[PDB]
Amino acid sequence: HHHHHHMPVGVFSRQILKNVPHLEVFLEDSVVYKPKGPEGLSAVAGWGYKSTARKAMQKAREWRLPYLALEDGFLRSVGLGHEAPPLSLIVDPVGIYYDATRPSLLENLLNFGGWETPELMDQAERALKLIRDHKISKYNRGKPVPRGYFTPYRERVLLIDQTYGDMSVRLGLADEDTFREMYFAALEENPGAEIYVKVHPEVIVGRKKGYLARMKLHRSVKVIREEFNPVDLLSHFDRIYTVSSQMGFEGLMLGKEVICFGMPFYAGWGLTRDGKRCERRKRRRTLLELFAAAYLLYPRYINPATGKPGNIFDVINHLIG
Ligand SMILES: Nc1ccn([C@@H]2O[C@H](COP(=O)(O)O)[C@@H](O)[C@H]2O)c(=O)n1
Ligand SMILES: [Cl-]
Numbered sequence: 277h278h279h280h281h282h283m284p285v286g287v288f289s290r291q292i293l294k295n296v297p298h299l300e301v302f303l304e305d306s307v308v309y310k311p312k313g314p315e316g317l318s319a320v321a322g323w324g325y326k327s328t329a330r331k332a333m334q335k336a337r338e339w340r341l342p343y344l345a346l347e348d349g350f351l352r353s354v355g356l357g358h359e360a361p362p363l364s365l366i367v368d369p370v371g372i373y374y375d376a377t378r379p380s381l382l383e384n385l386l387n388f389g390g391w392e393t394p395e396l397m398d399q400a401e402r403a404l405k406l407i408r409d410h411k412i413s414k415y416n417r418g419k420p421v422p423r424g425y426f427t428p429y430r431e432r433v434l435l436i437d438q439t440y441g442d443m444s445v446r447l448g449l450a451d452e453d454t455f456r457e458m459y460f461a462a463l464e465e466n467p468g469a470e471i472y473v474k475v476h477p478e479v480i481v482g483r484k485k486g487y488l489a490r491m492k493l494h495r496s497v498k499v500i501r502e503e504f505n506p507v508d509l510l511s512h513f514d515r516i517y518t519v520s521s522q523m524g525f526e527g528l529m530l531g532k533e534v535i536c537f538g539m540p541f542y543a544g545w546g547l548t549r550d551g552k553r554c555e556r557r558k559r560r561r562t563l564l565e566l567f568a569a570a571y572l573l574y575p576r577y578i579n580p581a582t583g584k585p586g587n588i589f590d591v592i593n594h595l596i597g
């Protein structure tokens with residue numbers, strides 16, 4: 277009893293526990309809704325930058341309590357956010373991975389270490405191979421790219437579109453017009469190539485609007501609105517253009533050349549071609565090291581079969597079946 281406490285985490289939105297019934301399992305603490313004061317609390321938590329989340333941040337500030345930034349894990353589910361609960365959860369008491377304006381737990385892991393062991397790196401190799409072999413991604417919904425869709429050996433590049441309102445854009449040091457710059461930069465650099473734009477799945481299903489999807493591009497540009505498996509789609513390109521999408525890291529995991537126009541969580545470590553700078557990120561990292569911290573250590577996994585705390589391999593085995 278000396279090594280544990282009964283001090284719960286405060287939240288200011290009932291929507292968190294609604295969308296994540298196993299929230300307390302992820303947090304390893306109890307949750308309480310709208311506490312009137314800090315006494316008895318071990319932290320406050322919020323989801324993204326919605327109104328209620330910013331109120332939680334303010335209370336953390338007021339009360340001098342840690343603020344836990346909660347997000348869906350990098351491996352989330354078989355289905356989009358509105359289809360099922362998340363299979364892993366990111367819980368960041370420092371900042372949040374997509375916010376390049378401050379440190380985050382993930383950035384701290386990458387900068388200063390404390391975790392690189394032969395045993396962990398072996399696990400990372402195993403998990404990375406399984407994800408590549410089984411074409412696993414965040415949502416695991418898309419269909420395969422049929423043979424004949426792409427012309428063999430034809431030069432082509434891929435631009436990744438995102439959802440309007442994505443906080444990772446502006447907190448990744450970019451803005452709405454960065455997507456237009458990314459497009460014309462790709463044109464100028466690849467005069468002989470075909471240009472493909474992949475619309476975000478949430479925009480395909482009509483729940484959100486996109487940046488590039490709303491633009492009027494040259495008729496020769498091929499805008500993809502079919503719901504292809506993203507890692508299957510990526511296999512048909514060598515060079516990827518992205519502002520701040522997680523799909524850029526999925527491309528990096530497949531060894532593609534990733535040109536970043538924002539500063540996402542995986543940029544600034546020496547593995548990407550960066551149009552932005554982040555002086556706070558100093559240590560160079562290999563892909564395996566970046567993957568180990570970002571996918572194995574940083575998220576909190578549940579064993580989908582038991583509802584109890586687990587690891588990345590529990591979710592992988594669940595996604596395969
Ligand atoms: N244009 C896009 C952007 C993202 N995605 C998928 O959605 C996930 C989340 O991407 P965002 O970071 O852009 O929301 C990606 O890791 C990828 O699996 C996609 O399939 N097509
Ligand atoms: Cl919230």
Ligand SMILES: [Mg+2]
Nearest residue numbers: 439442478522
């Ligand atoms: Mg998203």
